[PDB]
């Protein structure tokens, strides 16, 4: 019935589409050549949520590749699980947005958008119905942040009532790649705030923090960081394909985590993540899942939630597991950490149960938490935005192809008042 | 006679003469099911390190 349409833009998007669809193929038993193995009913009884039967018995992804340079699509095609994707869903740009938001958006975001939205329309309307879109990209890049946001604008205008899920990785304050760093962040934010339903915040230095401090890796590559995000976004959507005792889809998450439609920014995490040093030494119990999860060393955002206040929460569990230890732990957090939760909403979190746990783990949990700790992220992006916008630095790359000064002034104007309205619920 | 003994068909074989050298039949790269009729092609990509 319902299908989630994955769109992935930028070279972070094309890599995250290869790694998210190989953990989906891992649950579903999808052979890399396209077939199925595993001999179980529960995978294929909802296979239409992600996969389309292609009259050969093979299951193709509902994934929309997106980039402005063909090198990063050659790498994901040559890699394992790369022959799953339909080549027509690949769109090829030739010039490329070189870390530049403006030329990513307007004048090399226009000649490709008329063909990639032709792909999206061909794929979505071919299905009988929709459940929503899920666009994963980067907001520090050129093409994933420039025209990845412009697709978000046009499919929202065309299809307004469908959900707008978007996993977006942000600038890292500590490690500074893409040296024109806050311009790409801020220009994408003041569009995405009023023109999305659910934004999930990923930050690469938080993912480095969970590799080093809880997973005990020595050399974490980009493959491990990509694999960690794929844990979370598979667990957010685990009930769309597997049954449960208390069922929740993406619209379930939107209606509960959002008190006011303007604020929809969340911290995301997955449990459990430990090394082989402590793999055998720990009980996989429901209190152990939630005590490890409610801390700063498991969030995928570089904002400490102890500095703010959890406005709304949602713990979405997985596996064969008792329902009393769900709600008793989700109320013990309120009775213990009462000051870390807002007072004018009682029972701030939502439970959900997916009966099928992930591969090799008997029980897991994902978490979507709307807090005011997102605000300290936006001050730490803005104080570098205005530090180099006052002194007119690097703006000849931004005014020579279509913008003016007013669009830049509206950029911090539309996110500093996001900061101010995060203050009023603190 | 150059015709047959009983009924009128020529008997002396035939004398053919082609016009040109007759090459380039334009072997089409599409079959009756029209995929492309693929042969191993070239990658136009970066070195796959
Ligand atoms: N989470 C994640 N971030 C990445 C990955 N690769 C690159 N990045 C980040 O994305 C930034 C580079 O942006 P990029 O995607 O190359 O620009 P674009 O191709 O024009 O969209 C760097 O600062 C990296 O920190 C990845 O595989 N995963």
Automatic annotation (TrEMBL), chain A:
One of its GO terms (biological process) is microtubule-based process. Residues 47-244 form the Tubulin/FtsZ GTPase domain. Residues 246-383 form the Tubulin/FtsZ 2-layer sandwich domain. GDP 2 binds at residues 11-12, 15, 138, 142-144, 177, 204, 222, 226. Keywords: Cytoplasm, Cytoskeleton, GTP-binding, Magnesium, Metal-binding, Microtubule, Nucleotide-binding. InterPro entries: Beta-tubulin_BS, Beta_tubulin, Tub_FtsZ_C, Tubulin, Tubulin/FtsZ-like_C, Tubulin/FtsZ_2-layer-sand-dom, Tubulin/FtsZ_GTPase_sf, Tubulin_C. Disulfide bonds join 238-354. Its cofactor is Mg(2+). It holds the Pfam family Tubulin_C. GDP 3 binds at residues 11-12, 142-144, 181. Tubulin is the major constituent of microtubules, a cylinder consisting of laterally associated linear protofilaments composed of alpha- and beta-tubulin heterodimers. Microtubules grow by the addition of GTP-tubulin dimers to the microtubule end, where a stabilizing cap forms. Below the cap, tubulin dimers are in GDP-bound state, owing to GTPase activity of alpha-tubulin. This is Tubulin beta chain. The lineage of its organism: Eukaryota, Sar, Alveolata, Apicomplexa, Conoidasida.
UniProtKB/TrEMBL annotation, chain B:
It comes from the Eukaryota. This is Uncharacterized protein. It comes from Toxoplasma gondii TgCatPRC2. The chain holds residues 487 to 535 of 583 of the full protein.
